[PDB]
Design a protein around this ligand. Structure first.
Ligand SMILES: *Cc1cc2c(cc1C)nc1c(=O)[nH]c(=O)nc-1n2C[C@H](O)[C@H](O)[C@H](O)COP(=O)(O)OP(=O)(O)OC[C@H]1O[C@@H](n2cnc3c(N)ncnc32)[C@H](O)[C@@H]1O
Ligand SMILES: *Cc1cc2c(cc1C)nc1c(=O)[nH]c(=O)nc-1n2C[C@H](O)[C@H](O)[C@H](O)COP(=O)(O)OP(=O)(O)OC[C@H]1O[C@@H](n2cnc3c(N)ncnc32)[C@H](O)[C@@H]1O
Ligand SMILES: O=C1Nc2ccccc2C1=O
Ligand SMILES: O=C1Nc2ccccc2C1=O
Lengths: 499, 494
């Protein structure tokens, strides 16, 4: 019934918010729709796998908030296997390599690839992390899809194909589905193309020992009966002195303030009194989440390592069900496994198949890419299609179609009377990730602390000390990478010398 | 509590469905979230205006279902004033004209305009009304915005500016917001560019005497206490023998079947047990409605008629708050008024202003375009911003951003166990309109009748006899319109 703050949603963001408020001495309640906490993180435990992250899993350098929170809860990380060679599989052939991006030998194609990544980052530098709609060319960039941008920038099919995979992998959506401004912001706010795409020194460097679901679980343990499971919020009433929050199972909660820690579009599942202001009312119908099936195929041994492959496969082409894999073997070297994503339209296309049918297609793909018959001999399989989740809407995160971010972006984390907004989508650094969830949850909590006069305004947004355990190497470029011309750049140089 | 069919939503679609089922002998209940019926139609009555449609208003030839339903309910239509000249206002100057489309005089510009409308209709002919995702180039066209298409097709800024206005006006959305496939389907399923854009012989030909809100109101009168107002549906449970429907005000309804007659995205406001199938689960997060403020400025007299203007203004440019107007004067000639739309991004931009501030901007615009100081002397003003409506989500209708229609379009009216889907968004002819609302409501009702074994399969989709009161003249083209080359076509000949 009565408390200081109701937190709607018991994912990492809601849990981080609730913990901060609880630690500050306030009475909090977490209303969680599901019979579990963790939301878009979910760690399955059984005999065959020990544990496996079926949702959010990876953490890395510069994600200091999630690392600090997890450390405080008694969790440890381990490094994803990247000892051996990565594979780029292109036009039915595998090309082993080292470093974050597949090397390109053709001088024209090399110029094109170099210019693509460089230009993505160049454009990103013009986009404020906390206000992407303030970019000088915000409207121009927001009014085109990533497909249009790639069509303009990529003078080779090779670059366009890799760039397309990059988009599909980063935001589980098609290039034609997403705003160029939003995608450029998304990459920039993760630290750029290298940081977002890298395993070593990037977002995919590490996993939590025992699974990421432990973050939300351990906070629930701390909060005790303050977390209410199977309480989907249906109604928020702000017409009276205290905010009234009603759940589907016929309970009423009364609070001074509310934190909405759910994906923005899932705000639609709540009836509001008074109605939301126009901009938020429409915004929450304009912001879908992406589409992905996370699939883990288990083997007797990490046989790929014997062939000097680390387990990372970047797989181009429509026919391949999975475009990206990582070694998901336990740090001890057992429960050998390959994690793969079925992305965007393929998640829709292949969802119709049975689990056994998908397992077969994945094994046949992996056998081909790894050139290994051992890939046809899985011992176990786990998967999760996040498109089917009523209380997620998809994974990993919310994407913005063309035109939306400039028109509606401003209201994403704007308070509505006594409702404040958390959730990873409202973060300014690693939004879309567990890191962003922590940033947003703690920021929303501190907005309320400020509203209560408990902290000054300049304490709402708080910097985070760098992790001592996961230090961040800087992202560097070479002279040639910075100054080599683009393809049209080269053609202008030829135009000049010929004239 | 117990009935045969629960209809969620008391707009025209839900009401049409409920009436059909009721008329067939079934026990129906309509659960309506608002304290009124009509949904995206709303007729305001007061002294100053008598009545005014603040939502959906216009009907026209080929919209035979809405015309038949309204007639049965005892309603009549009258013609929107198009006796005098239309105005195209371009680069700060008014150009009076007759016919549906503003004339172009520059020869290259003429070819460009001609080709644009023609090409829209040519492309539409390849798009099945009942399955736009089955167009031969469905994926290619769905993967580009209308902005990209216009950028390709329009060799003149003149054509591009008019084409942009056309998109903004038809679907209350920006060209860059919407799928080309979806928009081309949308136009085609209204009968093409001429039919959708025309007043005389098109979608804007007529209004209902006393307002369109009377359609939903009069069906409510027929149904009596079967219509439950202020019953927002929050929960649908299909795990048991009978479907359970719960409302926000703590009531439970039990039925054999449910009709969802709400905008697709508003399905999100309902918690489902068991959860929806994946495709619908994601679809209902991908389908926003457009943005519009409908504004009606009242005057002592229809003064524009004295200058041989009918009151229709097509107004190009970013600065103009309103891009399109029609004479909203009563058939009797009194309550003189101009109806204008503030469209898409302008609805967002100008919503911040006060009602009085918007009135001033509109009057000053109209004074300019009509070349009349009388426009500065309004006697009354009414407006409605549909973006603010929790239980609409916007107006006029749902649009599909790039990539959505091909990926998710198939599930729009696919039944979920015992839930059937009505609402104008599910129609195949004049989807987006009151006509589409009627088509979809009656079709959904007949799907349930078939499920109950009361009618055969071939009776689910039913043709409609042409209105005798509003006959449709065919859409015709001239030899030159058909065969004149595009701008690049002319360049190839050169
Ligand atoms: C799904 C997924 C996510 C993911 C990823 C791979 C997949 C398949 N990989 C990641 C990774 O490697 N590293 C990383 O940092 N992130 C990765 N992601 C994304 C990540 O999981 C998310 O960014 C993060 O978990 C989001 O946290 P947040 O707290 O912001 O949101 P949530 O997890 O969705 O929690 C929301 C909770 O709210 C409940 N809910 C929803 N509606 C209601 C109502 N009406 N009432 C009460 N509760 C509600 C949900 O059940 C959920 O628990
Ligand atoms: C807004 C608008 C619409 C419009 C237009 C101009 C404006 C400003 N001009 C039109 C015109 O000139 N001619 C025409 O034919 N159409 C025009 N439009 C669109 C037209 O109004 C719509 O196409 C039509 O009204 C749609 O009817 P439909 O029955 O399909 O949908 P609805 O009116 O939105 O009704 C839905 C009802 O459902 C209720 N609702 C919503 N959620 C719930 C829940 N959870 N539980 C119970 N009821 C719910 C809504 O309140 C509504 O009544
Ligand atoms: O889970 C993941 N999220 C990502 C985002 C960008 C690149 C790779 C990945 C993953 O493997
Ligand atoms: O209400 C309207 N809907 C329309 C659709 C297309 C063109 C004009 C109009 C209107 O005036």
């Amino acid at each position: 019934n009565k408390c200081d703050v109701v937190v709607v949603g018991g994912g990492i963001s809601g849990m981080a918010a609730a913990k901060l408020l609880h630690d500050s001495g306030l009475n909090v309640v977490v209303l969680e729709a599901r019979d579990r906490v963790g939301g878009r993180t979910y760690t399955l435990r059984n005999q065959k796998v020990k544990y496996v992250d079926l949702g959010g899993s990876y953490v890395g350098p510069t994600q200091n908030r999630i690392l600090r929170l997890a450390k405080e809860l008694g969790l440890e990380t381990y490094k994803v296997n990247e000892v051996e060679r990565l594979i780029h599989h292109v036009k039915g052939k595998s090309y082993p390599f080292r470093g974050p991006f597949p090397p390109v030998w053709n001088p024209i194609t090399y110029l094109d690839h170099n210019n693509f990544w460089r230009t993505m980052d160049d454009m990103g530098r013009e986009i404020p992390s906390d206000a992407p709609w303030k970019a000088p060319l915000a409207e121009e960039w927001d009014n085109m899809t990533m497909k249009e941008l790639l069509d303009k920038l990529c003078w080779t099919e090779s670059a366009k194909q890799l760039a397309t995979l990059f988009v599909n992998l980063c935001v589980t959506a098609e290039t034609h589905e997403v705003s160029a401004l939003w995608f450029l912001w998304y990459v920039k706010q993760c630290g750029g193309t290298t940081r977002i795409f890298s395993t070593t020194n990037g977002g995919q460097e590490r996993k939590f020992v025992g699974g990421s679901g432990q973050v939300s679980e351990r906070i629930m343990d701390l909060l005790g009966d303050r977390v209410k499971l199977e309480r989907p919020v249906i109604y928020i009433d702000q017409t009276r002195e205290n905010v009234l929050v009603e759940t589907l199972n016929h309970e009423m909660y009364e609070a001074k303030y509310v934190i909405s820690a759910i994906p923005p579009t899932l705000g639609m599942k709540i009836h509001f009194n008074p109605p939301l202001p126009m901009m938020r009312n429409q915004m929450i119908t304009r912001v879908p989440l992406g589409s992905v099936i996370k699939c883990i195929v288990y083997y007797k041994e990490p046989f790929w390592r014997k062939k000097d492959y680390c387990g990372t496969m970047i797989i181009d082409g429509e026919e391949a069900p999975v475009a990206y894999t990582l070694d998901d073997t336990k740090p001890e070297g057992n429960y050998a496994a390959i994690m793969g994503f079925i992305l965007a339209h393929k998640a829709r296309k292949l969802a119709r198949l049975t689990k056994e049918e998908r397992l077969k297609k994945l094994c046949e793909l992996y056998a081909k890419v790894l050139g290994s018959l051992e890939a046809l001999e899985p011992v176990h399989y786990e998967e999760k299609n996040w498109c089917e989740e009523q209380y997620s809407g998809g994974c990993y995160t919310t994407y913005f179609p063309p035109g939306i971010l400039t028109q509606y972006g401003r209201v994403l984390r704007q308070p509505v009377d006594r409702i404040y907004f958390a959730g990873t989508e409202t973060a300014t650094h690693w939004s879309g990730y567990m890191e962003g969830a922590v940033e947003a949850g703690e920021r929303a909590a501190r907005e309320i602390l400020h509203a209560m006069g408990k902290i000054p305004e300049d304490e709402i947004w708080q910097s985070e000390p760098e992790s001592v355990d996961v230090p961040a190497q800087p992202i560097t470029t070479t002279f040639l990478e910075r100054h080599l011309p683009s393809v049209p750049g080269l053609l202008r140089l030829i135009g000049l010398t010929t004239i």
